[PDB]
């Protein structure tokens, strides 16, 4: 504390030093020989140093994140933790807190995947009660960490919406109106729905009829016409 290190502590500080200044072949070859000599010269080092790295392999390790998530999910429910993840996400990209937050949310995503959750379980956990909230950046980001892509995220929202293109579009647009919207990602979700219909080869007239038939606040006559026009001009 104010005093000398144990043999174990001292050797650990050496190995760390060597791994932090990183570097250089000729230096490596000599330093590793020296370290080896120290490890073998007595019989009470290998076990303890091994255990030390086992419990903490390096400065980027996240060894116990799953246990933490298990504790938290168990204590505060899937909905509790979804809410906390969505709400405490720092808005500042340079936030000192973003790392911690990414660890927590990534730990929850992994835990859920490993328990066998579906896309639907994830969206359901995220659900606030307002469709538009799915496309809010803080929510959409988490969702993407859970289902691994924008394609799967959009698709999961669509399916959670009973696969209703009108509900989906309404949500995307309303979202676009929102104050901190990420218009590029929203543009991408919109494009995604259109592309779903194109891929399945819908004629524009059938697209229009589909939008109408599926009628959560609905789409305006002008909205339906605008969507149909886009479909017609862009996605054949």
From Swiss-Prot:
Q: Where in the cell is it found?
A: Secreted; Host cytoplasm
User: Is Secreted tagged as a keyword?
Assistant: yes
Q: What ranges does the record give for the region WY domain 1, renumbered to this chain?
A: 65-147
Give the keywords, sorted. Host cytoplasm, Repeat, Secreted, Signal, Virulence
Q: Does the keyword Cell wall biogenesis/degradation apply?
A: no
Top-rank taxon of the source lineage equals: Eukaryota
For this chain's UniProt record, which GO biological process terms are given? effector-mediated perturbation of host process by symbiont
Broad class of the protein's primary localization: secreted
Give the comment on domains. Answer: The RxLR-dEER motif acts to carry the protein into the host cell cytoplasm through binding to cell surface phosphatidylinositol-3-phosphate (PIP). However ATR1 does not bind to PIPs, even though it harbors the RxLR-dEER motif at the N-terminus, suggesting that the RxLR-dEER motif is insufficient for PIP binding. The tandem repeated WY domains are involved in the recognition of the RPP1 defense proteins of the different Arabidopsis thaliana ecotypes.
Q: How does it assemble?
A: Monomer. Interacts with defense protein RPP1 from several ecotypes including RPP1-NdA, RPP1-WsB, RPP1-EstA and RPP1-ZdrA, via their leucine-rich repeats (LLRs).
Q: Which family does this protein fall into?
A: Belongs to the RxLR effector family.
What is the protein's name according to its record? Answer: Avirulence protein ATR1
> Which residues of the whole protein does the chain here span?
63 to 310 of 311
């Amino acid at each position: 504390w104010p005093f000398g290190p144990s043999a174990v502590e001292a050797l650990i500080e050496t190995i760390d030093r060597h791994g932090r200044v990183s570097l250089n072949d000729e230096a490596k070859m000599k330093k590793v020989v020296r370290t080896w000599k120290k490890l073998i010269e007595r019989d009470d080092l290998i076990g303890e140093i091994g255990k030390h790295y086992f419990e903490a392999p390096g400065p980027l390790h996240d060894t116990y994140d799953e246990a933490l998530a298990t504790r938290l999910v168990t204590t505060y429910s899937d909905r509790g933790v979804a809410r906390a993840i969505l709400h405490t996400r720092p808005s500042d990209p340079l936030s000192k807190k973003a790392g911690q937050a990414h660890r927590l949310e990534e730990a929850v995503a992994s835990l859920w995947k490993g328990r066998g959750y579906t896309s639907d379980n994830v969206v359901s956990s995220i659900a606030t009660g307002h469709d538009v909230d799915f496309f809010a950046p803080t929510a959409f980001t988490f969702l993407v960490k859970c289902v691994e892509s924008e394609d799967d995220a959009n698709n999961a929202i669509f399916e959670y919406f009973g696969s209703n293109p009108s509900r989906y579009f309404s949500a995307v647009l309303h979202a676009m109106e929102k104050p901190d919207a990420d218009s590029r990602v929203l543009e991408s979700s919109k494009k995604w729905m259109f592309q779903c219909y194109a891929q399945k080869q819908f004629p524009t007239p059938v697209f229009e009829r589909t939008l109408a038939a599926y009628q959560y606040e609905k789409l305006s006559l002008s909205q339906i016409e605008e969507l149909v026009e886009e479909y017609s001009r862009i996605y054949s």
